[PDB]
Ligand binder design. Structure first.
Ligand SMILES: CCNc1cc2c(cc1F)CO[B@@-]21O[C@@H]2[C@H](O1)[C@@H](COP(=O)(O)O)O[C@H]2n1cnc2c(N)ncnc21
Length: 250
């Protein structure tokens, strides 16, 4: 039970341009989407980039009616068994593309208040989970906060431009326990120092989940002031209704 978020690829990285030209895929007259898997549609207001893994070969899949999806082959195969693709049981990529080739691309992300978003590398993406595409919400995701900090602190080391990473976080969800940027609060509190502190990050993630859902209040968007508990399914429905998202199961 994930929510897939359709993140429009508006200009592809130079190293990806040769490849897209070759298969006659125009990201301007076609709707090419990176599809992020989330459990938190209510956080979409606070996207600051979209993550892919340097270590994953993604497929570019014909998603029907002029849409194309960039996910792992695993996730598009699953989608083809729940009427989310043109033909049931068909999941041949038009071609494959490695995560690194996409780094630096420009994107539009549904509901994001920040503008000029980029695709950025996340080494800690689990290839077998969701779509392998992970959207970045530094205010409320411990993992996203830790990776962002690490990208901004060592940008030359990661092969990225500093301009690409947003560090000014606009608060999205108010909690009474961890303030207005619960991911920051918890990363500081648990003193998590690397994207690879898996156990501690799982702990932080779990604590942020419970608090955000039961005690979180929206600070932005249509349902500002509302409890996350009440607002979340509405935001999710709006996104689906506007064609910006869809549900899909594992
Ligand atoms: C407290 C968490 N906050 C939070 C979380 C997320 C977002 C905003 C937030 F403010 C946005 O998208 B989420 O991050 C996505 C998803 O929801 C959440 C579901 O994980 P789970 O099943 O609960 O363990 O982790 C991610 N995610 C999706 N795929 C991957 C992956 N392959 N590798 C690593 N992380 C992945």
């Amino acid at each position: 039970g994930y929510v897939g978020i359709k993140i429009r690829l508006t200009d592809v990285a130079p190293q990806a341009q040769e490849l897209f030209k070759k298969e006659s895929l125009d990201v301007k007259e076609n709707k090419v989407y990176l599809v992020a898997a989330t459990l938190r549609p209510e956080t979409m207001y606070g996207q600051t980039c979209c993550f892919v893994s340097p270590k994953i070969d993604y497929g570019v899949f014909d998603a029907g009616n002029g849409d194309y999806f960039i996910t792992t082959e695993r996730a598009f195969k699953n989608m083809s068994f729940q009427n989310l693709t043109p033909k049931r049981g068909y999941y041949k990529p038009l071609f494959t593309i490695n995560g690194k080739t996409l780094i630096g691309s420009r994107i539009d992300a549904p509901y994001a208040v920040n503008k000029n978003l980029r695709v950025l590398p996340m080494e800690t993406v689990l290839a077998t989970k969701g779509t392998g595409v992970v959207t970045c919400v530094p205010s409320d995701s411990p993992d996203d906060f830790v990776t962002t900090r690490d990208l901004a602190n060592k940008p030359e080391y990661y092969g990225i431009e500093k301009d690409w990473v947003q560090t000014d976080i606009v608060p999205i969800v108010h909690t009474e326990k961890y303030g207005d940027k619960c991911a920051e609060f918890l990363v500081n509190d648990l003193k998590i120092q690397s994207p690879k502190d898996s156990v501690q990050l799982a702990n932080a993630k779990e604590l942020a989940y419970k608090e955000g859902f039961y005690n979180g209040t929206m600070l932005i968007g249509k349902y500002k002031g509302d409890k996350v508990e009440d607002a979340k399914p509405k935001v999710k429905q709006d996104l689906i209704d506007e064609g910006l998202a869809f549900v899909y199961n594992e």
